[PDB]
């Protein structure tokens, strides 16, 4: 369900004051609709810009907001998109986070292919829009929130 098999010890992940973290994803099947993403927290309230793009990169949807995971035993908050994004099968998408605030948790032991119980395989890959460190193995954006239509 989550990209990552594990979580970092403590909150060592820098936000780089808006320096982009991104991951590039693609699906096996038609009908997948993205409604949101999970992001790591810790260190209180964060301001974020989160953008979905499609392969040069074209922007599809941008949300801006704030979140905290301080009120929870979870290190993860879920951001909902303002318009859902229906994906093309076997097409590379990117999600990009610009985050502002203190150090957060991050994920590790990232999986390049995640087979969902519903039959869909998600393929995760490193994405040139990311420069703050997120890649297939570690960093931000542990989950994509979706349903099949």
Curated annotation (Swiss-Prot):
Annotated knockout phenotype: Lethality caused by defects in neuromuscular development. Mice die at birth without taking a breath: phrenic nerves are markedly narrower and contain fewer axons than controls. Mice display incomplete innervation of the diaphragm by the phrenic nerve. Intercostal muscles are completely innervated, but show dysmorphic nerve terminals. Sensory neuron terminals in the diaphragm are abnormal and neuromuscular junctions show excessive sprouting of nerve terminals, consistent with inadequate presynaptic stimulation of the muscle.
Tissues where the protein occurs: Expression is mostly restricted to the nervous system, including expression in motor and sensory axons. During postnatal development, expression is particularly strong in the cerebellum, hippocampus and retina. Lower levels of expression are observed throughout the cerebral cortex.
Disulfide pattern: 24-127
Domain of life, per lineage: Eukaryota
Coiled coil (UniProt feature): none
Cell location: Nucleus; Cell projection, Axon; Cytoplasm, Cytoskeleton
Annotated signal peptide: none
Processing and modification events after translation: Autoubiquitinated.
Renumbered residue ranges of the record's region PHR domain 2: 2-148
Domain notes: The PHR domains are compact beta-sandwich folds composed of 11 antiparallel strands and decorated with conserved apical loops. They are likely to play a structural role and mediate interactions with substrates or partners. The tandem cysteine domain region confers threonine specificity and contains the two essential catalytic cysteine residues that relay ubiquitin. It binds four zinc ions in a C5HC7HC2 configuration.
Similarity remark: Belongs to the RING-Cys relay (RCR) family.
Subunit composition and interactions: Interacts with MYC. Interacts with TSC2 (tuberin) when TSC2 is in complex with TSC1 (hamartin). Interacts with FBXO45. Interacts with RAE1. Interacts with CPNE1 (via VWFA domain) and CPNE4 (via VWFA domain). Interacts with (sumoylated) RANGAP1; interaction with sumoylated RANGAP1 inhibits E3 ubiquitin-protein ligase activity and promotes MYCBP2 translocation to the nucleus. Interacts with RAN. Interacts with ATP13A2; the interaction inhibits the ubiquitination of TSC2 by MYCBP2. Interacts with USP11.
Primary role: Atypical E3 ubiquitin-protein ligase which specifically mediates ubiquitination of threonine and serine residues on target proteins, instead of ubiquitinating lysine residues. Shows esterification activity towards both threonine and serine, with a preference for threonine, and acts via two essential catalytic cysteine residues that relay ubiquitin to its substrate via thioester intermediates. Interacts with the E2 enzymes UBE2D1, UBE2D3, UBE2E1 and UBE2L3. Plays a key role in neural development, probably by mediating ubiquitination of threonine residues on target proteins.
Protein name per Swiss-Prot or TrEMBL: E3 ubiquitin-protein ligase MYCBP2
Organism: Mus musculus (Mouse)
Gene name as annotated: Mycbp2
